């Protein structure tokens, strides 16, 4: 039930090799991974969860006991002295890493922000296809030449396009903002119960008039894999948010993200051919991440 | 038992980014979340559905009785 | 608690079980609860806001304002176009 | 279908900019 190869078919980009950095492949991949912990503690935690109970003395002992108030007691107990999180733990795993993953691609599929960002894609891959441009690079037939000229004419209409206090930069904060808060939340969370997991459990509930032996006490089954999977967890989600607060505090503080502008201005500066070298609340220097070449042709 | 994978699957629309406004985006995921939590109601109703009962009593109180009754 | 009248064949009357689903399903349902809730209020209050405003009829003068900074002569658009709603993913695919 | 097929085909026709940088 509920697979890594449909929770990745709920939510994957069509083809682009570009517009995803180191960071964000590492985001996407750790993310598997934790989905696949996640999963592995669904089956588990399906598999053999059942506690048992018994009662205190007041060889062997007998107690006249029939199976059937066994189980009933031990029901009883497992839905009175069980911790919360010794039981709904895979089940929130499996939510928060749904909210971690579309949370990492709803930036990616907004309606208004999909349109530029398909079209930009669209731009660098015909601009890619143009020999005159290896052409002129080799230097500093006959249809590539009337082909770049309207592809300039679309790439100076595409400039006159997407110049605002654009949705992207904005977006891609608030974006990463809210899954560093979700990091936050579930690490703040889970410190406190595994700090305090435990194997057996005393308890008390109300049915005296049915059983008798108003104190009993049972064993739970998952403590030590469930304890161990927990530190698993721990640390994969640890190694993510390190990667995530790391990575993206430093690209939010380093640069100004609108100095694309001075980008292509330092590009313009050695290209020995002087471009328009200004841009504004532009994205290619995500681009220039991923590969440099693409954007120096 | 109508499995997840059709039924996420049976949505699909290939050129269509055109076509949908941001509602029929967020209608749409919201649905397939929705379609998760159902799913795995059926499953988890499946597996562990069982209830139990037991006499009121008029040590262990025995009743005589046996496990099929 | 439960009252069945199984009571030739047993000899008890009034007795209970308890249920296994309960709070499972219980917590279930108000997540289920809360996803439709945002569901409807989303959806009713944005479809209410695109099926009162705009009337379908209005892509004609909306043509005619893309065409009073194009330097073109306007052009009466429609009586039945869904062109409001290509609009709402983008300006560029109506002005173009 | 077909309107969908419209614009797809609208999109890259150079003349459109041709004509819309001319006047």
Redesign the interface.
């Known amino acids: ?2 697979l890594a190869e ?1 929770a990745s ?2 939510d994957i980009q069509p083809t682009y090799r570009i517009l995803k950095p180191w960071w964000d492949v590492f985001m996407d991949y750790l993310a598997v991974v934790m989905l696949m912990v996640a999963i592995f503690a669904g089956t588990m935690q ?1 598999t053999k ?1 059942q506690v048992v109970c018994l009662p205190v003395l007041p060889t062997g002992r007998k ?7 066994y ?2 007691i031990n ?2 107990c497992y ?1 009175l002295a069980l911790p919360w999180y010794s039981k ?1 733990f895979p ?1 929130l795993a ?1 939510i928060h890493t ?1 909210i971690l993953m ?1 949370s990492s691609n709803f930036w990616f ?4 922000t ?2 530029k960002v ?1 079209h930009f894609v669209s731009i660098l891959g015909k601009c890619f296809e143009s020999p005159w441009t290896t052409k002129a690079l080799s230097e500093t037939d006959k249809k590539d030449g009337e082909q770049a000229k ?1 592809l300039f ?2 790439v100076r ?1 595409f400039r006159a ?1 997407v110049e605002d206090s654009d949705l992207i930069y904005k977006l891609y904060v608030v974006q990463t903002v809210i899954k560093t808060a979700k990091f936050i939340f579930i690490l703040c969370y889970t410190a406190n119960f595994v700090n305090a997991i435990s194997f057996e459990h005393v308890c008390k509930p109300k049915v005296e ?5 108003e104190v009993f006490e049972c064993t739970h089954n998952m403590a030590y894999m469930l304890k161990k999977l927990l530190i698993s967890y721990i640390s994969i989600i640890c190694v993510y948010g390190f990667i995530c607060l790391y990575t993206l505090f430093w690209l939010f503080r380093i640069p100004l993200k609108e100095y694309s502008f001075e980008k292509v201005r330092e590009e313009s500066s050695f290209s020995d051919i002087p471009d328009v070298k200004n841009d504004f609340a532009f994205l290619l220097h995500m681009v220039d991440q991923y590969d440099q070449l693409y954007s120096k042709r």
């Open positions: 039930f509920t449909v078919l709920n399906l969860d107690t006249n006991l029939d199976f059937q108030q189980v009933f029901q009883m839905h709904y089940y499996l749904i579309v599929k907004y309606p208004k999909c349109s398909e309207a004419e679309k209409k396009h008039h049915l059983i008798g032996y």
